[PDB]
């Protein structure tokens, strides 16, 4: 995020980091329950990648993080790699997340819910802060 | 890249207005947000765009794509969760 600010630690408890086996953060995701993470299809997750829950500072060794293995990747069959439309994947975890003060689920909308233009929302992540 | 988790608040746009920036690249399963002095950027992909509804944070978008320079005057593009939630529910029910 460019021109954002640091979050309060633990205040976005559904936010996860997807890391490859070298420890490199490549995408975010969100917990929707103890067993499932939603992310973008174009992130290209495999069962060799790791879901990291409960993290704030990726440079810290002292945080009580959960490193969760992925059982299966469910890429939405409507995903179109040419247009990047329908850009959603579900990850079924091999090991359930343990919910706590710093790890919990985001709500999903109903299909008919309305979010009007001009509404102020929030986005979070460990993406670049400057290009 | 930051070590520490970042946040930003930003407004939702309509798809019709987002098309002024991105043209025919914007599809019905996309939602735009930003152009407000902040931007999502590389490495944010897959993470949440949440809006508060009836006191609870609700997943409205999934960070998807946007400007190759993360311009803060151009809207970012997110997967529109309301268009995708029926598939989420079917997948969870079957697995």
């Amino acid at each position: 995020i460019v021109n954002g600010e640091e979050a309060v630690p633990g205040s976005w408890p559904w936010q996860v980091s997807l890391q490859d086996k070298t420890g490199f953060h490549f995408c975010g995701g969100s917990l929707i329950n103890e067993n499932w993470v939603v992310t973008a299809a174009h992130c290209g997750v495999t069962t060799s990648d790791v879901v990291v829950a409960g993290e704030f500072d990726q440079g810290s060794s002292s945080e009580k993080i959960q490193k969760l293995k992925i059982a299966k990747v469910f890429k939405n069959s409507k995903y179109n790699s040419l247009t990047i439309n329908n850009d959603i994947t579900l990850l079924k975890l091999s090991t359930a997340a343990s919910f706590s003060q710093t790890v919990s689920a985001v709500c999903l909308p109903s299909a008919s819910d309305d979010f009007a233009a001009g509404t102020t929302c929030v986005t979070t992540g460990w993406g670049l802060t400057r290009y | 890249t930051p070590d520490r988790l970042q946040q930003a608040s930003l407004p939702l746009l309509s798809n019709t207005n987002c098309k002024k920036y991105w043209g025919t690249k914007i599809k019905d399963a996309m939602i735009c947000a930003g152009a407000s002095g902040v931007s999502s950027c590389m490495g944010d992909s897959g993470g949440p765009l949440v809006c508060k509804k009836n006191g609870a944070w609700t997943l409205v978008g999934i960070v998807s794509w946007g400007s190759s320079t993360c311009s803060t005057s151009t809207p970012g593009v997110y997967a529109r969760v309301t268009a995708l939630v029926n598939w989420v529910q079917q997948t969870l029910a079957a697995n």
Partner: peptide, 10 residues
């Protein structure tokens, strides 16, 4: 869902 134990500050 959707209600953090540690409240965000925007």
């Amino acid at each position: 869902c959707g209600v953090p134990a540690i409240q965000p500050v925007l």
